[PDB]
Design an enzyme around this catalytic site. Sequence first.
Site, PDB file in Angstrom:
ATOM      1  CG  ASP A  64      -9.400 -15.728 -38.524  1.00  0.00           C
ATOM      2  OD1 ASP A  64      -8.190 -15.804 -37.844  1.00  0.00           O
ATOM      3  OD2 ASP A  64      -9.556 -14.960 -39.208  1.00  0.00           O
ATOM      4  CB  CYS A  96      -1.457 -18.958 -38.035  1.00  0.00           C
ATOM      5  SG  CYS A  96      -1.050 -17.726 -36.579  1.00  0.00           S
TER       6      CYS A  96
END
Lengths: 151, 150
Positions: A64, A96
Site C-alpha cells: 500500500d 483496488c
Amino acid sequence: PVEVTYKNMRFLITHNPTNATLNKFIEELKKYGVTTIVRVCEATYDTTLVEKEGIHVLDWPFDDGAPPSNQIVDDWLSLVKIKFREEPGCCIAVHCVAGLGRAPVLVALALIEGGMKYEDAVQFIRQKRRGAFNSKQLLYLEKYRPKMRLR
Amino acid sequence: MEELNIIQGALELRTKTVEDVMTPLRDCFMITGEAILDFNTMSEIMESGYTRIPVFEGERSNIVDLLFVKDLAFVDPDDCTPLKTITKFYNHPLHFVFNDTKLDAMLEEFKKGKSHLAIVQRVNNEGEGDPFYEVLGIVTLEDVIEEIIK
Ligand SMILES: Nc1ncnc2c1ncn2[C@@H]1O[C@H](COP(=O)(O)OP(=O)(O)OP(=O)(O)O)[C@@H](O)[C@H]1O
Ligand SMILES: [Zn+2]
C-alpha cells in the site's frame, strides 16, 4: 469508474466491487469494453463468475502506497503491449479496495511509456481524479526512466 | 445594520470554504440502508424534521444514497417495505464536493442543478498509504445562506 484514453491504448480505473454487485458490475465493465482486469490490492471476491463472462482477471498485489516492483512493472508493460495488439480498441481495467494510490500508478507508467511527459501525464490523471498520488508515488513517477518499450 | 451584514457576508464568499459552514458528520442525522420502513422507523424519520436524510451502508463515513421524506408518501407502515426498495424508486442525485471548495462556487452549483444538499469530502494525503477520500459531513443551501445573512 474513470476512463483514460491515449494513442491506441485505453484504460479504466474503477471502484472495487462487492460480491453481490457483480451482476451490476459486469454490466458496467462489458459496456466500456474491458477484456482483462488487474487487481493490485487484495482479493475481495470470487474471480470465477467474472472469468466465466469472458473477462480475464490478474492479481498482482503490492504494498500500500508503495511503488510497484520491477517484476510487476515489466509484466505490466508486456501485458499492455500484447493485449492491445491482440484485440485493438479494447480496454484494461485496474482497481483496488483503497483507491487513488496503486491503481493509477500502473496506468501512469504505461502512459509515460507511451510517449507522454511526466508532468503532462500526472496532470491528465489528477484532472480526472483529484489527489490520486501520495508522497512516495510522485517521486517514483518523476524519476522513472522510460524504455520506450511500446514503440 | 442587517444590510451591511449581508454585504460583508457576500464579499467573504470567496474567502470562506464549505468546510467552514458545513455540518460535521458526527452531528448528522442519518439512516442505515438496511433499515425497514415500519411505523416506528417512518415515525422517527418524520420526528427529526429533516427534509433530506443521508443513507449510509456499514460505516457512517460511507454514504450510498439520499432519502427525501416525500419518498415515504404512499409507503405503508404495516407493509414493512425495505429502504433499498424506496431508494430504487426515486433515486435522488448525490453530490460530493471537496472541503476546499469556495462558497461562491458552491452557491452557483446549488442554483444550477436540482439538489440543495452536498457531501463534504477531503483528500487524505498522510503517508505512506494510498491517498483516499474522507467524508467530513454535509453542507446545504441553508448553510451558505446562513453565512451570508450572518
Ligand atoms: N439530515 C440532516 N442531518 C443533520 N444535519 C442536517 C440535516 N439536514 C440538514 N442539516 C443541517 O441543518 C442545517 C439546516 O439545513 P436545512 O435547512 O437544509 O435542513 P432541512 O430543513 O432538512 O431542509 P430545507 O433547507 O429545505 O428546509 C444546516 O447546517 C444543514 O447542514
Ligand atoms: Zn430548512
